[PDB]
From a paper:
Rubisco is among the most abundant components of carboxysomes. It is generally understood that Rubiscos are densely encapsulated within the carboxysome to overcome its slow turnover rate and off-pathway oxygen reaction. The intrinsically disordered but highly conserved CsoS2 is thought to serve as the scaffolding protein connecting the carboxysome shell using its C-terminal region to Rubisco through its N-terminus. Using cryo-electron tomography, we determine the distinct 3D organization of Rubisco inside two distant α-carboxysomes from a marine α-cyanobacterium Cyanobium sp. PCC 7001 where Rubiscos are organized in three concentric layers, and from a chemoautotrophic bacterium [name] where they form intertwining spirals.
Cryo-ET STA of Rubiscos in native Halo carboxysomes resulted in a density map at 3.3 Å resolution, which allows a real-space refinement of the Rubisco structure. Visual inspection of the tomographic reconstructions revealed that the Rubisco organization within Halo carboxysomes is very different from those within Cyanobium carboxysomes: Halo Rubiscos form intertwined spirals instead of concentric layers (yellow arrow). Intriguingly, unlike the extra CsoS2 density identified in the Cyanobium Rubisco map, we observed no additional density corresponding to the CsoS2 peptide. We reasoned that this might be due to a lower overall occupancy of CsoS2 with Halo Rubisco and speculated that CsoS2 might have distinct associations with subpopulations of Rubisco. Remarkably, there is a clear density corresponding to the CsoS2 helical peptide in the Rubisco complexes adjacent to the shell but is absent in the Rubiscos near the center of the carboxysome. To understand the molecular interactions between Rubiscos in the string-like assembly, we further determined the Rubisco dimer structure at 4.1 Å resolution using cryo-ET STA and docked the atomic model of Halo Rubisco. In Halo α-carboxysomes, CsoS2 assists in organizing the Rubiscos adjacent to the shell (Mode I), or with the truncated isoform CsoS2A (in red, Mode II), while Rubiscos spiral strings in the inner core are mediated by [name] and do not require CsoS2 (Mode III). Protein abundance analysis revealed that the relative CsoS2 content in Halo carboxysomes was twofold of that in Cyanobium carboxysomes at the same Rubisco level, which might contribute to the different packing patterns observed.
Numbering used by the authors:
A (entry chain O): 3 to 110
B (entry chain G), C (entry chain A), E (entry chain E), F (entry chain C): 13 to 456
D (entry chain F): 159 to 316
Amino acid sequence: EMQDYKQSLKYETFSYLPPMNAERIRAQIKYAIAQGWSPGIEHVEVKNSMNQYWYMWKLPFFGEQNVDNVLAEIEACRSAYPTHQVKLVAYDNYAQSLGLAFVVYRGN
Amino acid sequence: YRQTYWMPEYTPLDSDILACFKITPQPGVDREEAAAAVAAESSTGTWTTVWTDLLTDMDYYKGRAYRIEDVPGDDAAFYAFIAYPIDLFEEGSVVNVFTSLVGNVFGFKAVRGLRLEDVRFPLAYVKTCGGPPHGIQVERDKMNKYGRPLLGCTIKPKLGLSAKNYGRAVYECLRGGLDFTKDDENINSQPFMRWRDRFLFVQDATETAEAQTGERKGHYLNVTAPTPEEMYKRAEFAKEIGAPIIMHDYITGGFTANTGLAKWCQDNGVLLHIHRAMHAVIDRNPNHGIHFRVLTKILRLSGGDHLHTGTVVGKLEGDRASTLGWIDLLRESFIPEDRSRGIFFDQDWGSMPGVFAVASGGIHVWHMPALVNIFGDDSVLQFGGGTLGHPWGNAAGAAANRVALEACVEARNQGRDIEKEGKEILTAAAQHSPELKIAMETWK
Amino acid sequence: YRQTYWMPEYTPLDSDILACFKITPQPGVDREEAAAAVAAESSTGTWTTVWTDLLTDMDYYKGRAYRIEDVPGDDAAFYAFIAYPIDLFEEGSVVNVFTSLVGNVFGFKAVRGLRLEDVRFPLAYVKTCGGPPHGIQVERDKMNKYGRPLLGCTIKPKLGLSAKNYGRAVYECLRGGLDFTKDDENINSQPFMRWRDRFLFVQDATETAEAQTGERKGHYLNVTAPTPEEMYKRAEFAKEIGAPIIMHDYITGGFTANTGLAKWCQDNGVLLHIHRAMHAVIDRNPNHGIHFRVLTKILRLSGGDHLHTGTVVGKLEGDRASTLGWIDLLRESFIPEDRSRGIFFDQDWGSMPGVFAVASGGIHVWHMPALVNIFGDDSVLQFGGGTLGHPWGNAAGAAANRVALEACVEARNQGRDIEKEGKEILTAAAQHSPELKIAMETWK
Amino acid sequence: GRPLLGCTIKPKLGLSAKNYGRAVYECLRGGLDFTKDDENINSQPFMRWRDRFLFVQDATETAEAQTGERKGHYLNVTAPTPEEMYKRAEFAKEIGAPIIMHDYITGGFTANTGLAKWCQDNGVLLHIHRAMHAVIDRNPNHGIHFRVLTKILRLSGG
Amino acid sequence: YRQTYWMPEYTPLDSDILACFKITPQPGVDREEAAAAVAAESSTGTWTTVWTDLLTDMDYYKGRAYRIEDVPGDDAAFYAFIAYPIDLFEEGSVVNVFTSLVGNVFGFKAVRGLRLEDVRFPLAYVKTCGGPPHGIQVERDKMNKYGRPLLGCTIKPKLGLSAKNYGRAVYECLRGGLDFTKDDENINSQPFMRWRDRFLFVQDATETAEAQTGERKGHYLNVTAPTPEEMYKRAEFAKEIGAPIIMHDYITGGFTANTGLAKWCQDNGVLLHIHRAMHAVIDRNPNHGIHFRVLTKILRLSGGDHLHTGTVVGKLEGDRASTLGWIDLLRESFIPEDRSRGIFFDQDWGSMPGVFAVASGGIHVWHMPALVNIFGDDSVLQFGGGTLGHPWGNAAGAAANRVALEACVEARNQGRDIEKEGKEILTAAAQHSPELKIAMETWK
Amino acid sequence: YRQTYWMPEYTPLDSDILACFKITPQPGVDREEAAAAVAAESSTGTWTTVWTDLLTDMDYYKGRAYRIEDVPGDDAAFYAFIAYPIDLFEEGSVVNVFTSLVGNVFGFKAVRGLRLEDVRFPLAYVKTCGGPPHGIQVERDKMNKYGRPLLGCTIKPKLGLSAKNYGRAVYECLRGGLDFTKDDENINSQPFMRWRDRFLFVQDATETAEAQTGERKGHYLNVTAPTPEEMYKRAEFAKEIGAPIIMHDYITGGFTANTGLAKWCQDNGVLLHIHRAMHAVIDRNPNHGIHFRVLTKILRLSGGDHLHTGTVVGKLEGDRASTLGWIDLLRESFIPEDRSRGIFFDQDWGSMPGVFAVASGGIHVWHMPALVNIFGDDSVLQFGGGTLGHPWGNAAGAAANRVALEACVEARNQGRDIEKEGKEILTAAAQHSPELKIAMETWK
């Protein structure tokens, strides 16, 4: 009755859950803006996903309050780079760390 | 004895070391007398003035009791507040401060019990100690982990596993989804499993799991040794093989050894996990001992990236304030005084980085929403039984724990009351995770 | 839980490590259950069998409770005897044995209190540890002192003395007649007095006193340091300047650091004085903690030439047996079981040399005949107040103490009851010693 | 065939090791041959020197791989003690940093000469910053000229 | 002489070192006198009491003969059993124990011959020595080899091969199927072939064979050197180039050098192969010498992962018991007394890991089923002639040996009598292995 | 087998290493066959030509038997003379030469016994080894002692003496008149007496005796250690404290360790005393083993200033030739072949300095004229019993021995037959020496 674990590559936070849709992505962005963090968008090759430094999509959205524009920028990054993994981050300036970081598209 | 070492009028300097002692005196003895007794025996140790006393500035080099307070709910005990000049201690020596405070006062025969409740470390003395080698934020940057608490596991049984079998437990635990695995406080180098073979096989398993998962992995390799030379050799071997984190027992191993290892870790870029073994012989008795909040301050002064603080959920709802208070002491930069949470002094840490909070002991998937709500993202959750007892294996248990963690974190981010809706959130996550579902079925 | 980790029929092997725990359980819980709980949590820590448990020899790698005894006079507590295989511990690691024994069992929630009363170290494990660097007889041979207890003094005040002033107290104390002076447990290196200046001026004073007296002199220079590197540097500087003895705080400094320093002392021919600071937070509570006899065994396993054991005279006549028992544990080669003296196990030490007994705290010329009768020649008597409080100075106080010591030793050698005739013996000695006479006049 | 391009990472204060590295990485991958540590940044509580060196080397390697041109960062090794300075320079060489930076006036001429000799021995390039030079060479009637300071610096090594 | 150093009533302590001597005395001399003579000359060396004798505890510091037994089948010899206190020897010094036992007693003129048959090492003294650096199980874990004996080969001729030619013999031998190749006891660094070139070319060949086969490979690189500095340099170079195993001559090189090299191997994670050169000048004579079982105990105390023990099949069926007994002494944790197998004392090893048994000398594919049945999986079979004499080359010979080994192991696992059915099993294997078939055709 | 490795016509080169083996073959086997067997197994070890054999110069790289001689008085044994090219051995490695000669040949099953009688070291190979660190003449120049044999003493009992008591035996022995005292082969570092305390107290006693007498004094401090690191540490400590001579056990300690220690002694200007412990297990059997003359050659090649050679007087008058022959081998620059004295080869030593001859064991004042006549001035006479058993003490015994030595030396210088007139000479000396007179009275 026991079932085996099927091994596969993972992508940090929220990678063990089913891939997020627009609603869940919007909820995460709303959380990020509610915590006072600055949303950011990054992308990199699948083979280079483990890189510490990803390609930055434009600049971090400082003071941005519209989750619709955040998601539109995510989709624009996906459209411009269709084979690249895309990550959404939230900069915490007080802690000099990231309050949230997860991939939106897992690449192909 | 009275007028000499206790001054009600004395206003303590911002550089003074302040200590709060819960004195349970023998019936009939004077409260001010007992306060001056703790102050004297912790600073000078005598009252009879000898000819060598007159060669020194007696008004300066002495500890003074400046305030006595009633203990709420305990008429047989009172709080003694004592101020110590910063000049009385070696700069950057938690060992010397600890010795000066607790060397002889606990053997005082005129009190039935003595507890050291809180100690105020001034910023001037704080700036001298090295502190945590890396800190929470630097460790997060190094491990490339953000937005969720870290997951750990203690490899069990504590006895019997060879190097390869211990490695083949660690490998499945890590490849299942845990960020870290943990060497037990007992495992440093035993006849059934030598430390070098431990380090080699553990590094092999960690590298294999990291390659097969895509996430940075680690194991708190225990470097507690009979000798500092052996400890330094084990830490150097861990760095040579590439282990990103090691573990030390800072109480049984010793504060001097822990400070040296923390300085070495800061020098060599190796993360340090701290285990609090023996802490119960010291901090459990309510009327005699030194508090775990004081031990936490001492540990973060000495240096360490992780520290066991308790599971919080393991106590009743009305007994969580002291644990939360010492959690804030460990993690936050400035902790205001809070008598309800047991914080007796304003504690300014300046720029010293925080230390990750470790929750371990009898906790599984069901406690997890409460654990997330209480600890926040800056904590490490350890699942020994909750991972090894999984019917499908260590990898399946780790996957269940990771899925539950991610679901709870997302639920908290969405603005839901994760403690109120924990069962619903976990069930919704289990609709996509058979391992998680069978985990709740096992541990319900 | 019951049948698995407690075997009434089990006969413990001569190589097994045996531990005796005084369990004060919660009312209603089973005695055998609590005994198995201490045995399990001190050896394996769990009862739920996981799949990794089946990979090991569970029958071997576990601690077992083999005997439960009533506590005389305490119906709420019982004695649990637990046997541990020698394979469970690192060879020659008091740190590892101590951690395995006391890591988590004292935090057990099903018992109100847990005390570790006695621990049996088998000769097989004893032969692995280095033990005392020199021992009583080798230290006597090196110092050329025989037939009388050694005399020491703690330099007071603990605070304020510069290097030269501390040296000019030590010099008069030594030239007065004391074999040793003692650095306080607080003095390692403070802003008012740095450690290098301490060592230099102390060595100058010791050399001057030795030259002016004709007897070998020493000072327990404190090498307790924030880091093992600093401790080793201070010990090496003491050896370089020629100091014959150093001092360490083996509890606050740490067991690992103490073992390393003891090994270094054995290697470099430097005597080691051990101070027992903090011991009261551990051994004072009658229902929770670890006994000072266990601490004494641990210290002599780690290494040390001197050890504070208490003044014995400081307790009532009916409460001296436990102190005498741990004195025998520290000094004698084989200590038979003695329930009256608190010796729960036969303790065979083999060839490991004994450790000098140090009596200190509130003792003066009047306690001295009792001190001699109780301790014998193989002990060190410390006179801080009894030397510094002398109206004629440190040298006169030391001369008084030395004259009293020699008179008491000769009286004991002549076959007199020194405790019964103490006043007469001291008066007869004072007929030739004005310093001694004024000493009794001061401290009567 | 062209002058080299550099950039000073700003602000002088506040950037963590990773954030400073993620400024350096974009600066280098954009086209600059070098980036520059500020004369203030040697090892501060908000950003320790070892983390600086590690993250800077990571960013430099990533930019070099993604561009195809040799990259560098003047890692500041100015330290309170010559032992600390030598340790930082040795760590930079160990991690593979091709160039380091020193403050030759505030750090001292003896320290600068020793560091220059070490750089010549170990094949590490040395960037020299002229902090404080204005307290000396600005006054037209009292001081020592920056041309004399330049001669002194090139004699010392850089 | 008689009453002083032999006590029939003495019961030997569990910590006592016991030695059994086969005494072939001069006709007419007393058996008890000769036993006391061996006991005295091996412990104190004299009978005339001098004034310095009275300064010591003569009753303690002496070896005593407690039992005399007849030798079955030899009326001219008797067995003398002598007990030695553990205090008589340096802790962890096989050199000191060996010297104390055999320094002068073999030159005794009142006996025609003296043989040291067995020596009892108590667990207390066993726990002090380092023992084998890795042991059988740890070596198996490191090499990833289970379920079959290991295969080795001695590269021949002993003389003439350059570094590259020796490497091109080793490469074919390893790529043919042998787990190991062996440097000869003569080859450390000769003018025709220097040691550094040996190590480099051997490592190249081993790496090439490992890459081309998919199995871990090794070569016992000889580090026996004129000086310990040279030996340590060669071992360090082997570790630097990555050689997993080295070889030492523990008798000709010396017990001190072997112990140092074993400690270095345990420290650096390098396997140690031990060759028993010269053992015949010592253990061959039936009436004078020290037995190879005692030499095996000494070697496993000193440290080593492999040890030559003989081919067992090389003796008649009625002369195999002593070889099997010392095989059990080398490999097993506890060997009960067995007079038929030559085990005179119960030998408790505790947790010290076993040592691989090496069978070498005149053995080929035909002896192999008997070799497997006798030695089991925990042994190394060496085929010098049986691999190099193969008509198709070293690779073909190694393939033949490996196929025969796997077939015999599978036949044993299936429950067949491999010795009774050896020819049938080998023929059935040869139906799929032309190299094996031609190997039996060559060596029939 | 025959034609290949034995050449009757071969004339051995002056650079060839020659070995003489006494072969006691199994009845019926051919003498030339057995000689070729020893030659082959000591050089190549096989007869079956393999493909790797054809890659080398087989005519060169092999040992050849060139002469077979009858053993006088033994029809069951014959002498085999074998020549070895100098190319077969590492330059300056007694370890390698010894291994090549005796690795496997003694385990040959076709001979009942094999003895290595003599080995010829060519001057070319002799010039490579370091040899004795100082030599007889350089040691005499350093110690400022000429014209008489040196006097030594073994401190007894071998067990029980503390450092100070051993020193207070050494001090009286040296101040009595002996040039040296001797640590026993058992004493390196025991629990009852540690090596550092030995070295310190021995140096103190030696310095005191030298100051009180006016003659250079020394003690062979034993540096035989479990590890070469420990041995080098002990030798370095001896040099640091100023000990002029140390002692090593070159057989039990090992030839590699002895060569390293001899090189260190030559580098650091420290004299080396060599003890021959275990030599009896090797050289006693007349039909199997390696001769003490070969062991003496090996020792002087390795390095050493003193060497035990036997008392010579301990054998009958008709059995002294072999002892005298190996004495000449140890001391003289060129020893011609002498079958009566057991010298089978002309042995040219060139410029290598001689080694002092040590006579020890059961010798006292009466043997002394014979000892002087036999050994000459270039020898060391050891008096353990003959000094410690003196009724008036160690100093009186040493004075008696010294007076007897000086009287015998003067009698020899005057041209008297000291052996014929020994009693008269000793009595005439005793007319001025009461200690000497009572010494003869005790030992008559």
